[PDB]
Amino acid sequence: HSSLHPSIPCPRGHGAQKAALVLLSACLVTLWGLGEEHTLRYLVLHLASLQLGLLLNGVCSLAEELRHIHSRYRGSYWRTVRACLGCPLRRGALLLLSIYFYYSPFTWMLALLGLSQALNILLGLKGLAPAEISALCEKGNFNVAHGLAWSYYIGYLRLILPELQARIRTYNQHYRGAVSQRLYILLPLDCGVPDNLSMADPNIRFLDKLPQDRVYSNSIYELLENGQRAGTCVLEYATPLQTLFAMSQYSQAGFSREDRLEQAKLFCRTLEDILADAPESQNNCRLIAYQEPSSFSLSQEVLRHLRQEE
Amino acid sequence: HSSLHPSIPCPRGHGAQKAALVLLSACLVTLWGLGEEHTLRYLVLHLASLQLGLLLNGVCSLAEELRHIHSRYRGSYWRTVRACLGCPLRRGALLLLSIYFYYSPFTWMLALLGLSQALNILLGLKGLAPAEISALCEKGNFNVAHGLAWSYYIGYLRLILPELQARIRTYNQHYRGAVSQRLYILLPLDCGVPDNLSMADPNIRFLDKLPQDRVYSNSIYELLENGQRAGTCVLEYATPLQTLFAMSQYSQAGFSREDRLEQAKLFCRTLEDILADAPESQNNCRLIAYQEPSSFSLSQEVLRHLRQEE
């Protein structure tokens, strides 16, 4: 229990599976009504016919995973097969057990299963309950990309992006000076965010403040390509990406450097979708989702996005 | 597509179900090998035997949902049955269609299904693929309770809670004055957060600052019970709860006042679990998860938690 308020739900315990012992016993107190007996033969010759269906679902869902294998699975085939089917060790042990039992019209008996499992997912019947949907979604304690993208747009973006173009031209009309039309939001996929950008590259080393209630001290950085001013624009890291970084450095929380490469591949995607919904903000700021491999320099890919403005 | 970087995965399209048309056609180009024919009879007399299993799973999972019906479903029985089974209109239409077809050993034929669906969830075979687990979890754009609880503990709690007891005794040794041992974090379940607490109740009306790099201007409030100082403690609202409030006032985002009563019933739970993991913080701050119904006064339930300290 330990609930601080009666409205707040306790986490879901094992009350679901302990009712299955009752359901298992209820069909097994029928045993004398069953015994007078090849009922163990028809159990595994039925549980094969479910386990082909989950196998045929993993085959059919593998066409979707194949499109995103490189982005999601770094170009590896074996991670895609593991993601498509799951843990087949508990399943395949029931496969090879069922081979012996029907050994003790099979070409038709596969033709019914592939026909059934096609219609079972084409008419949308492969769909859980809203309890089971909210069971596993409450199970993962780190589902932390939507809560960080939306806290960044509500918290920091929508409070600074309408008033940004005012401070751009004011710093431009004070200067002489050249200022980029929109703010640049860097998105390091490795989540390594330094507090200063002057050590991220020697090219970026610069600082300036801007005039404007809510004190937001944005910083303009100069991109010094081969010792020459190739572009003066405002750049700022993603503040939720330090949150994903500091969660991996919270070793009590089971947050790896691989979960940190999933949410930072998702928060960088959902933030584009949030900025695509707001009309003015999509033309107000540009996201740079740079990832450190090989060697590179991030001052080029800023200037990839900066030169294409004009 | 529209991907800003090749590592970032595009959202999952309909490539999964369009491969099922191939699987449906592959078992249906076997038709002359099937036709020479009651194969439509054995399709629905098989798809009943899957649809009893999903029905028997919803019956068995209903024992778990019943424990949390009041907290999750406000004490309503019909919302619990809808959450346990889902949308039975696409399923029950295949139920009553299958009644006519076997009409055109049933007591045993139910005894095998309840035996099978018990073992199918007791040996953990009711378990999806990590693609399908990450399919629906990417589908809900508002999974925003873990991303707000963890951004509050990493961002604001762990930066102010170690240095809190220093500022409590310093404001106490400057005074005369009585200060509570730990900071109080209010959690309004209706997400209605005013910028001042003096209008939340007339009892709370007070303000003070505290001495201390990171400027965090906490505010101490006096609880004036019947015009008398019943307790002087520091109280502050949940800043992620204004985020859940402002998302509902973003009408382009499909965020209702019912989703806002799920994440604010979850962020208030996960924040307790995060503070339970950190050893010093659990004895450093106390969460008050008050919910406005009926009439009430929140200055009492602060003093419920304040008087029990000593």
Author numbering:
A (entry chain B), B (entry chain A): 3 to 38, 41 to 108, 116 to 186, 191 to 227, 237 to 317, 321 to 337
What does the paper say about this structure?
Stimulator of interferon gene (STING, also known as TMEM173, MITA, ERIS and MPYS) is an endoplasmic reticulum (ER) membrane protein that serves as a sensor of cyclic dinucleotides (CDNs) derived from infected bacteria or produced by the cyclic GMP-AMP synthase (cGAS). Upon binding with CDNs, STING translocates from the ER to the Golgi apparatus, wherein STING is polymerized to recruit and activate downstream TANK-binding kinase 1 (TBK1). Further structure-based functional analysis confirmed a new STING activation mode shared by the agonist and the SAVI-related mutation, in which the connector linking the LBD and the TMD senses the activation signal and controls the conformational changes of the LBD and the TMD for STING activation.
In fact, several gain-of-function mutants of STING have been identified in patients with STING-associated vasculopathy with onset in infancy (SAVI) or those with lupus-like syndromes. However, all the three domains of the SAVI-related mutant, including the LBD, the connector and the TMD, showed overall conformational change similar to that of the full-length STING bound with HB3089, implying a shared activation mode: the connector senses the activation signals and controls the conformational changes of the LBD and the TMD. First, the contraction of the LBD in the mutant was slightly smaller, as indicated by the larger inter-Cα distance (47.5 Å) between residues His185 as compared with that (44 Å) of HB3089 bound STING. The intrinsic force of the connector of the mutant, which is somewhat correlated with the steric hindrance of the connector residues, is enough to drive the structural changes of the LBD and the TMD through the revolution of the connector helices. The revolution of the connector helices has two effects: avoid the clash between the two residues of leucine on one hand, and release the intrinsic force of the connector on the other hand.
